[model samples]
Target: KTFKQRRTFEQRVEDVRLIREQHPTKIPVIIERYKGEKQLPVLDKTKFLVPDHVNMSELIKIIRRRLQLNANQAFFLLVNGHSMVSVSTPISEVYESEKDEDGFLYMVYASQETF
Candidate 1:
């Protein structure tokens, strides 16, 4: 696999705390959670959603085609959250550059916040 930037622990905490704690119940909580990022680059894009009226079948087809996912690939992801692709940990070195197949490094960094 190729290496890209990793995510920060604070990002992980923010994403998890907001989604796990706020979803399907407290929209206000999620709103407040992302309020700080409203004008920042780390916008709350996870709120991006699909309309209920959208064609489900077409959506699946489009996803598979664009992502080049086969049945097994899609199925594997169906039951698992892709934590590996999370932006919570950033990788500074690629496998090719490090010459270490298992050297996928992730760092957890975040800016300070005021209470």
Candidate 2:
């Protein structure tokens, strides 16, 4: 078996830069609050730019924070009209498989108790 050579710091940085240039600067995600859910504040169709490799749970946390939700609040997040397999679902995979023509992934959120 052939042994692989390790990359240097400068080489790794250059590789990262090249990779960045190949992809979008931000992942586009569009979120809407479930209609008729008066428990949460009215949130119009909103767009969020997230870092690459963000997880579904992290995204949900960000939304909760933005909405000023309390820790005790329970929320449900559905991606692309589908329930997420897990909180660790990668945002990249969701975006790639479900993004619309505008390259935006749609998510709907509602209070868990509403159902």
Candidate 3:
């Protein structure tokens, strides 16, 4: 058998540890503003650095403050084309599976449409 096939569980753990050591602790979040009815200042840079353990809801509040949106403004934040639910959900969990190859979590903020 090949040497790689003969590696034990401990070897795999060490490999994972090395892999993690090469990555950055901060998660890169790239947010885009939807061109809709929302009246907010245009951002020159849409990229942000977020902690791995940040809550989903707290991320929304951070965006709101950065955009200077009034409390009455309504918006929907979409990650990987799916609506983010559960305010208690950790951002790291979502980033683990959905992050792009470049290690960016892409999100889109759109105005809440009226029915």
Model 2 residue 75 CA deviation in Å: 0.8
Ranking by TM-score: 2, 3, 1
Task: Give the per-residue lDDT of model 2 (tens digit) for 1-115.
Answer: 1001244546545544554566566676667777657678745336566786888889888888878899888888887777887888688777777765534577878886343
Superposed model 1: Cα runs more than 4 Å off: 1-4, 24-62, 65-115
Itemize residue pairs with steric clashes in candidate 2.
none
- On residues 1-115, what C-alpha lDDT tens digit does candidate 3 reach at each position? 3222455657645544554576456566777766563555655566576877888999989888888889787867888657765767888888887775545577877776331
Lowest lDDT sum, 10 consecutive residues, model 1, at: 25-34
Query: Which of 1 and 3 is ahead in lDDT?
Result: 3
Of 1 and 3, the candidate ahead on TM-score is 3
Q: What residue pairs are clashing in model 3?
A: none
In candidate 1, which residue pairs clash? Answer: 6-89, 6-90, 6-91, 7-87, 7-88, 7-89, 7-90, 8-88
TM-score winner among the candidates? 2
lDDT of each: 0.28, 0.69, 0.69
* Model 1: residue 114 alpha-carbon error in angstroms: 47
Clashes of each: 8, 0, 0
- Minimum summed lDDT over a 10-residue window in model 2 is located at 1-10
- Candidate 1 lDDT, tens digit per residue, 11-111? 54565356435452211111011232222233222232222233324434433454454565421111011122322221221212322222222211112
